[PDB]
Design a protein around this ligand. Structure first.
Ligand SMILES: Fc1ccc(-c2cn[nH]c2)cc1
Length: 209
């Protein structure tokens, strides 16, 4: 049972700016998604400081990068706090309407797309490299859901019947055909060392074959 939703106008315009602008420094998407994961991991560690049973759904706090060349996908898994259904619908837990207002003022006043993370909407930089993004998520207080969008002004949300997650968020990037470099081992390593050396959680890059 799939529900289809319209993006708010300001979000749809942010995603088409990201899809259509000529901007070569596309590798920042990964920095942005890892930093979102690290923020959700901070949130569940804070909650467990007073209630330890909030880690009954998994005590390990980590980030995994899983390239898959046959599927042409890059997946970013974290065991962070996760999103409820209401977070998913509400622009994936962000204040995206006002953050796009600020961001897209800054672009006309000096800034460039690489500062998108300073406005709370870094998730959407995923569309620099992906034609389609799927977010599987499980929050302790809700069921597991799948959010899905190929841009074009709409997204879908459904109950995910697949592999139980325990707790966390899985961002699946279905990459554009000319962005396959972000599936190679040495290119991902180079981006993680460049932009994410101080993330306070173990980032494991899986290998293939
Ligand atoms: F409210 C939220 C909770 C978790 C996340 C997230 C983003 N990447 N991984 C997890 C985003 C919003």
């Amino acid at each position: 049972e799939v529900e289809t939703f319209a993006f708010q106008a300001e979000i749809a315009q942010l995603m088409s700016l990201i899809i259509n602008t000529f901007y070569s420094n596309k590798e920042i998407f990964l920095r942005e998604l890892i930093s979102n994961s690290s923020d959700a991991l901070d949130k569940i560690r804070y909650e467990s400081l007073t209630d330890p049973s909030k880690l009954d759904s998994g005590k390990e706090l980590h980030i995994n990068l899983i390239p898959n060349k046959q599927d042409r996908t890059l997946t970013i898994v974290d065991t962070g706090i996760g999103m409820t259904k209401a977070d998913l619908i509400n622009n994936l837990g962000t204040i995206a309407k006002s953050g796009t207002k600020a961001f897209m003022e800054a672009l006309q006043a000096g800034a460039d797309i690489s500062m998108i993370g300073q406005f709370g909407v870094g998730f959407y930089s995923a569309y620099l490299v992906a034609e389609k993004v799927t977010v599987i998520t499980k929050h302790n207080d809700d069921e597991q859901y799948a959010w899905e969008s190929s841009a074009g002004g709409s997204f879908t949300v459904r109950t995910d019947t697949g592999e139980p997650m325990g707790r966390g968020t899985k961002v699946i990037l279905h990459l554009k055909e000319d962005q396959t470099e972000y599936l190679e081992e040495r290119r991902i390593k180079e981006i993680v060392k460049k932009h994410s050396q101080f993330i306070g959680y173990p980032i494991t890059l899986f290998v293939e074959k």
